């Protein structure tokens, strides 16, 4: 595949735009996303709208969100020129500001931080698009009486890092980010604890496995980079004493949403050249690349036969991308032979996930050769039936998403239910986005992004009636209709849907009758009101009944949620024999099987959204 790293970086940022919760701006690039989570924080009297959905679900998990914004800001701090020359600096700042704007709302008071919106079990029990979520979305906080030094520390890092990269274009937003970063760090430092002991729902999804000692160091050093005030470098270095004996610092994992030791020690290594950090960084990167030499033996992470450094089953590419980012950043600083070995490791790992692998395919949705088609993502899939296999293919392309990837034997299945293969997540793309920036710096000369991308897709039929003839005689027609909301461009809740069924009364007028002699009556009914005949075109004796489901919520969120049924009969007086459905507009093409018809127009709040009037 002819790689284009400006296009790739463009698409990675587009993934974060697909993860946006809240009210979306009118110039949003993704026409299949709409307003969602508009009531986030309403149960606690707060505007907590905005921010990112974590993955293919709709929980706003604060700890990996803070991590993701921090790593995204980190890469703009290291490679601002790459972002600029690829045309992606504006997009990168705009996407990071979505996250940091939300952190500013969540940081309601200096020692109070809202850290989750959405309950994991309630959110994950339902499969559908963000815009029509039907369940309650409770908000959860840490504060001084129930703290979270990891969450507060990591969010402080996100704000402090963002404050640096925003200073050139928006100094007063930078200063606001910085001021909150200092407050959140003091919260994390003064009130010690794991956030998942206080937002207990988080234990089941983003448990604080590593504790908070790494985020305290991470938040402090980012504050030092953002202020150059010695007090924060001292605090960072002092916090490192809680890491224990430097000879026992862990090195077999990597930078992740839970463990930022690897990021903090790297940053401190560049600032101090202290052997504690230099050796710990190189232990980790040796283990990941050519092997860590214990003088005696060589210790190395598992590699797949295809060449992927493979940490564990879930998010294997995320982990290799995370390691490649540390390698890239360290190899831009260190002067030793390590710099070459680590740089080659990072390039090779990045080339693997971009297509150079035994599957011969890109693992980035919408990019490269044979990319993943079924990422585990509710809104991009666009189900109206609360079913992962309906529709059989995704309605929307989730451009830029790095999927979980292969197992330790390079095996991989592009299947919406294969979570280990096809999970997508904001933390998955965070370091990866920076690596793409680096790949553009290294190999992207003359690469330009895609103009006016993506093109808006023509929607499928989103609102429509399926209708059938119950029976029809010489004095009546009885219709069965199911009114559908299968919206996806974007999905939308509708509670003011209606339709009109049109008839021609010429044969009635010729027999000496009029619309006054036709009675329209509802039978089996799921909350609809059925009107008597109203004129559409009096000169041609065209009339319609208005069938209204006013106040009934219909939405693409389940087998029963997406449709409502009404059966209705149009009756001439009993014993008359003039009634003729064959010239009736909305009778055309109907059979006795329920079937979509374009001749029963559908309306939402009075606005025509489907079908044709006579
Ligand atoms: O799904 C819960 C979380 O578990 C842990 C994984 O590393 C994350 O990628 C994942 O989002
Ligand atoms: O299980 C790993 C262990 O390996 C030993 O060689 C180290 O001295 C320990 O610090 C470490 O915990
Ligand atoms: Ca931690
Ligand atoms: Ca007729
Ligand atoms: Cl349902
Ligand atoms: Na497909």
């Amino acid at each position: 595949y002819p790689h284009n790293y400006a296009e790739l970086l463009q698409k990675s940022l587009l993934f974060y735009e697909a993860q946006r919760s809240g009210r979306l701006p009118e110039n949003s690039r993704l026409n299949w996303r709409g307003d969602s989570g508009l009531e986030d924080g309403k149960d606690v009297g707060l505007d907590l709208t905005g921010g990112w959905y974590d993955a293919g679900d709709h929980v706003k998990f604060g700890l990996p969100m803070a991590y993701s914004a921090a790593i995204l800001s980190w890469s703009v701090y290291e490679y601002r020129d790459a972002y600029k020359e690829s045309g992606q600096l504006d997009a990168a700042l705009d996407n990071i500001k979505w996250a940091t704007d939300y952190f500013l709302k969540a940081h309601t008071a200096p020692y109070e931080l809202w850290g989750q919106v959405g309950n994991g079990a309630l959110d994950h029990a339902w499969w559908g698009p963000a815009e029509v979520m039907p369940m309650k979305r409770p908000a959860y906080k840490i504060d001084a009486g129930c703290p979270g030094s990891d969450l507060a520390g990591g969010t402080a890092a996100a704000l402090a890092s963002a404050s640096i990269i925003f200073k050139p274009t928006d100094s007063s937003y930078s200063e606001k980010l910085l001021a909150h970063a200092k407050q959140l760090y003091d919260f994390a430092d003064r009130y010690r604890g794991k956030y998942s002991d206080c937002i207990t729902d988080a234990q089941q999804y983003y448990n604080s496995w590593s504790g908070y000692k790494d985020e305290l160091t991470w938040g402090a050093v980012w504050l030092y980079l953002a202020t150059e005030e010695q007090q924060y470098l001292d605090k960072a270095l002092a916090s490192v004493s809680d890491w224990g004996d430097p000879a026992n610092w862990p090195y077999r994992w990597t930078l992740s949403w839970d463990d930022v030791t690897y990021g903090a020690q790297l940053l401190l290594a560049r600032l101090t050249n202290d052997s504690r950090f230099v050796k710990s960084v190189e232990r980790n990167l040796d283990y990941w690349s050519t092997g860590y030499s214990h003088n005696g033996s060589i210790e190395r992470i598992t590699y797949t036969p295809g060449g992927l450094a493979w940490l564990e089953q879930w998010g294997s590419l995320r982990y290799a991308s995370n390691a490649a980012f540390l390698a890239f950043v360290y190899s831009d600083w260190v002067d030793t032979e390590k710099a070459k070995r680590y740089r080659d490791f990072a390039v090779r790992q990045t080339e693997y996930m971009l297509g150079d692998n035994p599957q011969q395919r890109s693992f980035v949705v919408g990019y490269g050769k044979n990319p993943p088609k079924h990422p585990h993502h509710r809104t991009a899939h666009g189900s109206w039936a609360n079913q992962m296999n309906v529709p059989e293919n995704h309605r929307h392309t989730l451009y830029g998403a790095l999927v979980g990837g292969p197992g330790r034997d390079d095996s991989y299945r592009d299947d919406i239910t294969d979570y280990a293969s096809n999970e997508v997540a904001i933390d998955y793309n965070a370091a990866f986005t920076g690596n793409v920036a680096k790949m553009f710096q290294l190999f992207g000369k003359g690469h330009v992004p895609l103009p006016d991308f993506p093109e808006k897709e023509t929607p499928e039929d989103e609102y429509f009636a399926e209708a059938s003839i119950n029976s029809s005689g010489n004095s009546y027609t009885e219709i069965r209709a199911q009114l559908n909301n299968r919206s996806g461009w974007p999905a939308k809740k509708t509670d003011q849907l209606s339709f009109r069924y049109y008839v021609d009364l010429t044969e009635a007028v010729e027999a000496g009758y009029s619309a006054e002699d036709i009675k329209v009556t509802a039978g089996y009914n799921e909350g609809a009101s059925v009107s008597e005949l109203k004129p559409h075109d009096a000169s041609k004796h065209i009339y319609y009944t208005e069938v209204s489901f006013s106040g009934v919520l219909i939405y693409p969120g389940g087998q029963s949620a997406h449709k409502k049924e009404v059966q209705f009969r149009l009756s001439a007086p009993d014993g008359t024999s003039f009634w003729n459905p064959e010239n009736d507009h909305s009778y055309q093409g109907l059979s006795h099987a329920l079937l979509k018809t374009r001749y029963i127009p559908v309306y939402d709040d009075g606005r025509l959204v489907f079908g044709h009037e006579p």
Side-chain angles (χ1 to χ4, degrees), residues 200 323 367 397 495 606:
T200 63
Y367 178 80
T397 304
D495 62 355

Side-chain angles (χ1 to χ4, degrees), residues 550-563:
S550 187
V552 179
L553 175 57
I554 316 177
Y555 59 99
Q559 281 296 351
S560 293
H562 78 263
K563 67 184 182 303

Side-chain angles (χ1 to χ4, degrees), residues 245 247-249 251-252 294 299:
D245 189 337
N248 301 328
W249 293 358
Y251 61 94
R252 297 185 188 126
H294 302 272
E299 190 184 0

Side-chain angles (χ1 to χ4, degrees), residues 35-47:
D35 291 350
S36 65
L38 300 187
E39 299 200 352
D40 291 0
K42 182 179 156 71
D43 62 328
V44 295
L46 294 170
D47 178 1

Side-chain angles (χ1 to χ4, degrees), residues 54 204-206 257 312 314 318-319 419 423 425 427-428:
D54 179 69
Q204 310 176 107
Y205 310 97
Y206 284 100
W257 60 264
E312 81 163 349
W314 292 284
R318 165 265 317 262
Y319 286 130
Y419 188 73
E423 168 69 323
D427 88 280
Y428 285 21

Side-chain angles (χ1 to χ4, degrees), residues 89-167:
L89 186 57
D90 295 341
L93 294 178
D94 182 62
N95 275 279
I96 293 162
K97 191 183 196 296
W98 199 270
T100 61
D101 277 356
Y102 172 79
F103 299 144
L104 291 175
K105 295 190 183 74
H107 189 216
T108 41
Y111 304 94
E112 187 177 87
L113 177 56
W114 294 89
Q116 180 168 326
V117 181
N119 175 267
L122 291 177
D123 183 81
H124 295 180
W126 177 78
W127 191 268
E131 293 81 9
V132 300
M133 274 182 288
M135 73 296 281
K136 295 181 181 174
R137 292 176 50 75
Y140 306 108
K141 62 168 162 58
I142 61 172
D143 58 17
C146 213
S149 308
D150 30 32
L151 178 61
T155 304
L159 296 174
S161 59
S163 83
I164 305 178
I165 70 170
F166 275 100
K167 196 191 264 301

